[PDB]
């Protein structure tokens with residue numbers, strides 16, 4: 001409670017913190033509502049405390065640019081640590097300073113458009129697997145839970161694009177490879193924020209927020225694949241070729257592989273559910289997209305890398321969905337030095353925070369922000385959108401490295417699925433969708449819809 005004076009001293013407003021707890025009791029409605037509220041109550045900048053940890057929110061796009069881009073390497077290089085990580089210290093998204101700068105370099109060529117175009121044929125084949133599982137549920141007019149069928153697809157793309165493994169997860173939901181990979185503001189991480197001194201305790205104990213079993217399975221599963229291709233197109237290959245030179249270690253390689261799975265599993269699948277919900281409760285947008293897809297790919301023509309970038313309304317739909325549901329919710333950098341940015345003094349050790357969800361729904365930049373209106377991303381209006389207000393993939397050197405992959409992956413899933421099906425609300429569909437009051441951007445109730453064969 002000896003750090004709870006910091007914002008009062010700097011003249012920064014914020015809600016008054018309780019001893020030890022900081023302002024965390026105010027997460028009872030979740031990060032995003034607390035963010036929105038703070039924005040409205042306090043203005044362009046405010047402070048609060050995760051326990052003893054001062055956090056300064058900022059919403060000025062100049063200041064956001066300074067932090068995210070201009071002063072990334074100098075000052076705002078790392079995210080705030082969260083729990084016991086074990087050997088995953090070496091994962092790119094968790095690593096810090098120069099080890100991050102080295103991993104980011106070693107892994108950037110992996111995510112070029114040129115490597116992505118080579119992955120389209122592989123991400124296409126499981127779009128076909130996706131249709132056949134959906135059609136089995138459309139001919140038996142039973143409502144569908146998107147997260148299971150989309151999760152099966154995202155999961156199918158990940159194992160293929162990162163290791164070559166080819167499974168029909170929805171039908172082999174219990175192959176050993178599919179088991180490990182799916183697993184694990186909850187009672188744990190709040191305790192971490194009130195007792196962050198307990199992290200080094202769990203480290204020496206080898207306790208990990210990564211189930212020690214999943215990680216042991218893939219550490220060895222990778223070293224089998226590694227020594228089965230060596231010697232006799234995916235992320236593992238691209239990393240194995242990179243350490244054929246400063247170059248990527250062996251346990252370092254396992255760790256990035258693991259980050260890529262958590263990265264694109266719950267995210268690629270969660271997003272596709274958000275887009276199918278909006279498509280269902282807005283059937284004209286849904287028709288408008290089916291017309292655009294049939295126009296570029298007549299006769300259910302299979303999508304190609306080039307035809308995907310041809311589809312503008314598709315891009316508009318995806319982009320608007322991420323405005324209502326930016327699954328990061330917040331961006332964050334730890335300030336590593338006393339700094340002054342855009343006229344404001346920022347003391348060393350503050351976490352700086354961009355409240356994405358809240359800025360995506362700000363009426364001061366967005367007309368009717370709670371409404372799903374894709375036209376805001378029309379080539380006409382897309383110019384009047386501040387790229388430091390709309391940030392579903394972050395920005396600057398530490399933006400989402402897998403952005404071009406994620407967009408492509410989702411767009412391929414959509415094109416095939418709208419080439420073949422229409423999606424209609426059920427009586428059991430939650431309208432309007434309520435967001436989880438928990439710690440992830442997800443729906444209260446899972447999205448259930450009706451699927452019909454075109």
Ligand code: HEM
Pocket residue numbers: 092093094104259260263264267268271322326327328331332391392393394395396397398399400401402403405406407
């Ligand atoms: C629609 C899906 C996704 C969204 C909305 C998303 C969003 C984000 C955001 C907002 C960040 C933080 C950006 C920042 O701090 O400025 C991030 C980081 C990251 N994402 Fe994504 N992401 C998605 C999917 C993926 C996928 C599929 C991968 C596959 C490899 C991936 C890999 C990463 C990595 C490695 C980072 C950490 C970057 C670093 O610290 O160097 N993400 N993502």
Ligand SMILES: CC(C)(C)OC(=O)N[C@H](CN[C@H](Cc1ccccc1)C(=O)NCCc1cccnc1)Cc1ccccc1
Pocket residue numbers: 079080081082093094184209210259262263264267328332400
């Ligand atoms: C700032 C704080 C305290 C949250 O944690 C960090 O220090 N940074 C994050 C590290 N933990 C997560 C989740 C995870 C879960 C299980 C095991 C390991 C990791 C992480 O690895 N995300 C990358 C994967 C990912 C996820 C969604 C979009 N893109 C990529 C990186 C991060 C965080 C939030 C959004 C984006 C990226």
